[PDB]
Amino acid sequence: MDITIFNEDVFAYDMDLETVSSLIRELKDDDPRYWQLAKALQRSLNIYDERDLE
Amino acid sequence: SMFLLPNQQLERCDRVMQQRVKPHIHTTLAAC
Amino acid sequence: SMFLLPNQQLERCDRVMQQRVKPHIHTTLAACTLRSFHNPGEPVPSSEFLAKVRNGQVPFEPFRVPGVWGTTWGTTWFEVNGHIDMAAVKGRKVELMVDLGWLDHRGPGFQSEGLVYRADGTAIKSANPRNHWIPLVYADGSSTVELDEHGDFTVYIEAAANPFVEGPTPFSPTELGEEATGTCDFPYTLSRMDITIFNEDVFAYDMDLETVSSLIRELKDDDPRYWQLAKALQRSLNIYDERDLETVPAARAALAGVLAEPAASSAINHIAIGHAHIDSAWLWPVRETRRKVARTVSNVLALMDEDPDFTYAMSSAQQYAWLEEEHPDLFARMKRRIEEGRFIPVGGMWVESDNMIPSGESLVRQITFGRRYFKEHLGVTPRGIWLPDSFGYAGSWPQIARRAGFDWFLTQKISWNDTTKFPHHSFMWEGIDGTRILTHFPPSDTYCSSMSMRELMYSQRNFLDKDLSRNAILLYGFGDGGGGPTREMTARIRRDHDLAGAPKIDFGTPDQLFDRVRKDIVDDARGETPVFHGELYLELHRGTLTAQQDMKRGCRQEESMLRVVEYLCAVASIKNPGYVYPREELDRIWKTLLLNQFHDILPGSAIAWVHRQAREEYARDIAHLRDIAAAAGQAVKEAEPGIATVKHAVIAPYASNPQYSWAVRDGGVIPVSVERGGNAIILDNGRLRVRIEADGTVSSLIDLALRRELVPSGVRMGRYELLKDEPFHWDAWDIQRDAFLAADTLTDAMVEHVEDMPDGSAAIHVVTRARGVEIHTVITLRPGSGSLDFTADVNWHAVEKFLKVDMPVTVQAVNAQYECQYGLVERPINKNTRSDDAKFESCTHRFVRIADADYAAAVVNASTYGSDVSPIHAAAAHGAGRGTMVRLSLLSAPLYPDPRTDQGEHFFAWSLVAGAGMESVLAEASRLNAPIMGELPAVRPLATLTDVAGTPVLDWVKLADDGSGDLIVRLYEAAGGDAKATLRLDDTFAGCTVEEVNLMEEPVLADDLPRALVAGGPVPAEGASVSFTPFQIVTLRIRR
Amino acid sequence: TVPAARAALAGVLAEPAASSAINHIAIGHAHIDSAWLWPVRETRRKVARTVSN
Amino acid sequence: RNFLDKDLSRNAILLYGFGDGGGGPTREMTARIRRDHDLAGAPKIDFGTPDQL
Amino acid sequence: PINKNTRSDDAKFESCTHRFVRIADADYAAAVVNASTYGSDVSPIHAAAAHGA
Amino acid sequence: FDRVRKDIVDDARGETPVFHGELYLELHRGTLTAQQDMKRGCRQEESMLRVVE
Ligand SMILES: [Zn+2]
Ligand SMILES: [Zn+2]
Incomplete structure (x- = not known):
């Protein structure tokens, strides 16, 4: 139980990742949206680094 | 160039939320 | 009348087991008194502590029925006093129902455990998370414990509190497996512990309900068996009542009407084997695997005491030796049970080691040590290899296994691939040369199975070879580091002998199953035998090859040390009499080097304890081997005075000159010239022209001997890349395709002063810096050669990275x-x-060779075990940017098993060879991977090969392990073409006989093996001719 | 070559079925319609053909 | 597969023979019935009468 | 392969x-030179013999 | 094809699919030795054209 400051960009990025990942799971394997979302998620995940939040 | 495995990317992303991106939403500064 | 809903009956039955029938299996009758004595340190052997208690020197404090007792990596002794009374439990089993307070969703074998020792000192059983009953009084009068005058007894539980290494989130960094801190971190809470009586009919009814319910779930909705089973379950569930237990017989009979129908005569005849894979060191130190194997053996023997028609298996003779040394009674009981034929020791290897990383000499050492141990301690000869958990299998295994006497092979980890599925589950694995060995895979794809019916039919469904085999193996028993078979699975096996709708499964032995497979797929197909040629390559992990580089480096160093010291000891023994062979210390260095090569140690995945003890043992062994070599050399010089003296005494198995192969040449015309012109440094040694760029990179390595340029003009040699790897499953073991995409090319470096070595060599120093990594790299161009040497000192300090060159x-x-x-x-x-x-x-x-019709280039390694080869087609003109790239993996930074991995200074070395002939590559690799000694006397080579026709090579020279003094030579081929050679000894080995023997060193040979001699009888050892088939292995014994 | 081939195929044609199947009973039946697409003078011919067959 | 009462009956009827106005059993089906007396993987079928069923 | x-x-x-098929190892190679046929098949042989013959 | 070049060459920047070797159809395979006279004559006239040219 401690005083904390809130980060907005990190929360927005987390929510976007959650939305994309949840949309990928339920789609079929015969839809270009599935592959496009998977490729976008792979591209995005290779840039985010927790050692520097910029 | 390597092939794409969406079922592996899903698990990687799930781990990313579980361990990496969730703790970085609130930054502590003191105690009460 | 109402309709039937099977999906509702399934949930009703599930609730019935969860709430109603499970608690009515054990009926409590009294309670026992507990006292505790704690120890947060290195455990004392149980033999001494029980004797001390018997004499009486240790106090005991009262312990309440509830409460906490645990301590991080600590031990405790619970003295337990019961008050069981006879004359009222006649004909009924009595148990203990010990509960240390295990967690639910953690795992069966990764928590606190403990044996229940008798007062005298013997062992009774162990308290496991899934097996927590101790047999006190059997139904037929017999009592394991000794009862006193007025009905009371006492036992001693040796509780060991092992904290769970894994943290809150999966694969999280935890500072637990570092030391034995005496603080409360994960304290276990004790639970119910009372004397209970066992009910048989209730347990049988529960097992029948479980079998029926599990069979209903997996069946389809278009099979009359499904509906019949659902109706039978509904009928049976309406009769059983928990308010009065006399209704059990009236309900079992109704349910048994559909449990006696024979299955269809087309199912797979499974053979069930009890197996419990005790990992020698993964998450616990080498001092805890002894306790774990003792617990496993005690549990297996206790279960086998009452239940006939049971089988079990146990490899890793290391554990057999430990059990014999530290538990005479357990070993005696195990040997007594072996005579009956229900405790089959399978697996002739000394310990379940890795395959890809260890050298072949280590593999043959394991095979011979394990086979000798089994032969002369247990009097049983194994027939096949048993490696149910390993990462990748080398192609040379079939040949070694067949020449060692084994005739079948069993593995299961290949099914853990990521992309492809193996074509077969029972086939003939063909070695690199010609060697075919029978290989079988467990269809269930698990060595630790709970014998669930879902898994039972999954094995049948996943069987690819379903058309010509009709036979499969199934290993059952909570394992993966602790456990062993329980009553539940041994009841399921008996219930599922010929149950309709499920595959037929019975007890048996591996030899019977492999004979059945041989009959089915070899002697019956007559031309349809499946064959798999090449090597078995696991498609998972792949990051283990370059994790904890210190272990692999030390292993290579001590392998070379053993080779040199064994050669020197053989020379000393054969030169002058009175020199006792250091057999004892040699076998002490062995069985410890070989132990450290385990499948969860050598690749590197464990807590800091294992990776620290391994380092300390490596250093101690290296020092002792150097001392032994120096002593042997000093002994040799006493045979006759004033022979010679050699500085740095470099010994290599192979050399460019055929007569200089096993020479004693020391370790230390056209001096190299440097032409500092422009923004580059150009060297010239008469056969190569290398152009080092501004910042420690090579842009041209022109071969002046052939006017060939072998550096593509799209990239620069020597560049260091820092790939970011963040694995999500099996962090240390595995590296994913995430790398090789987010590559980071280091571009912060500057050359240093170019130095001309006093001997004549030329060296260029350079420093490279990164976020937390610094590298001091020297490039050496030795005069009068054709190889460019690279050495690097790395100060790795980053986290979650990957270094490549x-x-x-x-x-x-x-x-x-x-x-x-x-x-x-x-x-x-x-x-x-x-x-x-x-x-x-x-x-x-030790090398990677890329070859075409004529020209070949090699990258000879020193201490790294991983690399990657990829084509390069960059942007250039006139086709100047086409070629191949071989990136050597230096080291990674795993985080889960060890919070700090590879911190400090690491040394790397390698070289590049142009015009790479096979002999030249072998000779230069031998030069690079050779120990540097001090001052040992120079001696002529013991055995030489003068008429070389091909690429023969001396691999090993040693003495006979039987004490006869016989000389042993091990030879192999390393090119692929056939080889013919003549072997010549020196002086004292005149009028001798040389005979071909197997890898076991005994003089018996098979028929299908190619053989290397001309007749087979004793041939004189002067001008003896040896013939080689592609990649042949030959072992020769020479008499006095 | 027919006898040498029937025996090889008959090895998997004599295995008893699982003791859970439905015991079907087969009845020969030819439904003859009195008058659909033909006059009442043709159903006599049709039933005669059926009985003769 | 289409039998709804699969839990308490274990009995079914099957009429064979070309019908819908003309036909009657031929040699092919009366051979199939004999071949499928107790064939594994298929339901058991035998000759009989409606009264017995 | x-x-x-x-x-x-x-x-x-x-x-x-x-016009030819060549099977080669480190040093020794054997060729089957063709004249007018455009098809062939290569298969390993591990027959029953002694001393790996 | 210009669209494909833009999509998979100038945009992937290192993710271009590559297939090395030869494209081998896994069907037919009997055409290589059917009507041998045609292939024989074709080889003969190819040599004839070489020499005559
Ligand atoms: Zn293991
Ligand atoms: Zn009609």
Whole structure:
């Protein structure tokens, strides 16, 4: 139980990742949206680094 | 160039939320 | 009348087991008194502590029925006093129902455990998370414990509190497996512990309900068996009542009407084997695996005491030796049970080690040590290899296994692939040469199975070879580091003998199953025998080859140390009499080097304890071996005075000159010239012209002897790359395809002063810096040679990174040549299909060769075991940017098993050879991977090969392990072409006889083996001719 | 070559079925319609053909 | 597969023979019935009468 | 490939040849030079013999 | 094809699919040795054209 400051960009990025990942799971394997979302998620995940939040 | 495995990317992303991106939403500064 | 809903009956039955029938199996009758004595330190052997208690020197404090007792990596002794009374439990079993307070969703074998020792000192059983009953009084009068005058007894539980290494989130960094801190971190809470009586009919009814319910779930909705089973379950569930237990017989009979129908005569005849894989050191130290194996043996013996028609298996004779040394009674009981034929010791290897990384000499040492131990301690000879958990299998294994006497092979980890599925589950694995060995896979794809019916039919469904085999193996028993078979699975096996709708399964032995497979797929197909040629390559992990580089470096160093010291000891023994062979200390260095080569130690995945004890043992062994070599050398000099003296005493198995192979040449015309022109440094040694760029990179390595340029003009040699790897499953073991995409090319370096060595060599120093990494790299161009040497000192301090160095060469081909233990292997460079992509990281041994019709280029390694080869087609003109790139993996930074991995200074060395002939590559690799000694006397080579026709090579020279003084030589071929040679000894080995023997060193040979001699009888050892088939292995014994 | 081939195929044609199947009973039946697409003078011919067959 | 009462009956009827106005049993089906007396993987079928069923 | 390992490798059991087929190892090679045929097949042989003959 | 070049060459920047070797059809395979006279004559006239040219 401690005083904390809130980060907005990190929360927005987390929510976007959650939305994309949840949309990928339920789609079929015969839809270009599935592959496009998977490729976008792979591209995005290779840039985010927790050692520097910029 | 390597092939794409969406079922592996899903698990990687799930781990990313579980361990990496969730703790970085609130930054502590003191105690009460 | 109402309709039937099977999906509702299933949930009703599930609730019935969860709430109603489970608690009515054990009926409590009294309570026992507990006292505790704690120890937060290194455990005392149980033999001494029980004797001390018997005499009486240790106090005991009262312990309440509830409460906490645990301590991080600590031990405790619970003295337990009961008050069981006879004359009222006649004919009924009595148990203990010990509950240390295990967690639910953690795992069966990764928590606090403990044996229940008798007052005298013997062991009764162990308290496991899934097996927590101790047999006190059997139904038929017999009592394991000794009862006193007025009905009371006492036992001693040796509780060990092992904290769970894994943290809150999966694969999280935890500072638990570092030391034995005496603080409350994960304290266990004790639970109910009382004397209970066992009910048999209730347990049988529960097991029948479980079998029926599990069979209903997996069946389809279009099978009358499904509806019949659902109706039978509904009928049976309406009769059983928990308010009065006399209704059980009236309900079992109703349910048994559909439990006696024979199955269809087309199912797979499974054979069930009890197996419990105790890992020697993964998450616990080497001092805890002894306790774990003792618990496993005690549990297996206790279960087998009451239940006939049971089988079990146990490999890793290391554990057999530990059990014999520390538990005479357990070993005696195990040996007594072996005579009956229900405790089959399977697996002739000394310990379940890795395959890809260890050298072939280590493999043969394990095989011979384990076979000798089994032969002369247990009087049983194994027939096959038993390796149910390993990462990748070398192609040389079939040949060694067949020449060692084994005749079948069993593995299961290949099914853990990521992209492709193995074509067969029972086939003939063909070695690199010609050697075919029968291989079988467990269809269930698990060595630790709970014998669930779902798994039972999954094994049948996943069987690819369903058309000509009709036979499969199934290993059952909570394992993966602790456990062993329980009553539940041994009841399921008996219930499922010939149950309709499920595959038929019975007890048996591995030999019977393998004979059945041989009859089915060899002697009956008559031309339809499945065959798999090449090597078994696991498609998972792949990051283990370059994790904890210190372990692999030390292992290579001590392997070379053993080779040199054994040669020196053999020379000392054969030169002058009175020199006792250091057999004892040699076998002490062995069985410890070989122990440290475990499948969860050598690749590196464990807590800091294992990776620290391994380092300390490596250093101690190296020092002791150097001392032994110095003593043997001093002994040799006493045979006759004033022979010679050699500085640095470099000994190499192979050399460019055939007569200089096992020479004693020391370790230390055209001096190298440097032409500092422009923004580059140009060297000239008369055969190579290397142009080092501004910042520690090579842009040209022109071969002046052939006017050939082998550096593509799209990239620069020697560049260091820092790939970011963040694995999500099996962090230390595995590296994913995430790397090789987010590559980071280091571009912060500057050359240093170029130095001309006093001997004549030329060296260029350079420093490279990164976020938390610094590298001091020296490039050496030795005069009068054709190899460019690279040495590096790294100060790794980063987290979650991966260091690589690339050595591109313009030679273009399709397949790259790595080397296996005793041969070579071809692997594709340009990955075409899906399955070809998964082989993006493979193990390498001391060199990688890329060859075309005439020209070949090699990258000879010193201490790294991983690399990757990829084609390069960059942007250039006139086709100047086409070639191949071989990136050597230096080291990674795993975080889960060890919070700090590879911190400090690391030393790397390698070289590049142009015009790479096989003999030249072998000679230079031998030069690089050779120990540097001090001052030992110079002696002539013991055995030489003068009429070489091909590429023969001396691999090992030693003495006879039987004490006869016989000389032993081990030879192999390392190119692929046939070889013919003549062996010559020196002086004292005149009028001798040389005979071909197997790898076991005994003089018995098979028939299908090619053989190397001319007749087979004793041939004089002067001008003896040896013939080689592609990648042959030959062992020769020479008398006095 | 027919006898040498029937025996090889008959090895998997004599295994008893699982003791859970439905015991079907087969009845020969030819439904003859009195008058659908033909006059009442043709159903006599049709039933005669059926009985003769 | 289409039998709803599969839990308490274990009995079914099957009429064979070309019908819908013309036909009657031929040699092919009366051979199939004999071949499928107790064939594994298929339901058991035998000759009989409606009264017995 | 000569020894077909996987499913896809088996399908390449007959391939076109032009005027020769060469099987080579480190040093020694043997060739079957053709004149007018455009098809062949290569398969390993491990027969029943002694001393690996 | 310009669209494909833009999509998979100038945009992937290192993710371009590549297939090395030869495209081998896994069907037919009997055409290589059918009507041998045609292939024999074709080889003969190819040599004839070479020499005559
Ligand atoms: Zn293991
Ligand atoms: Zn009608």
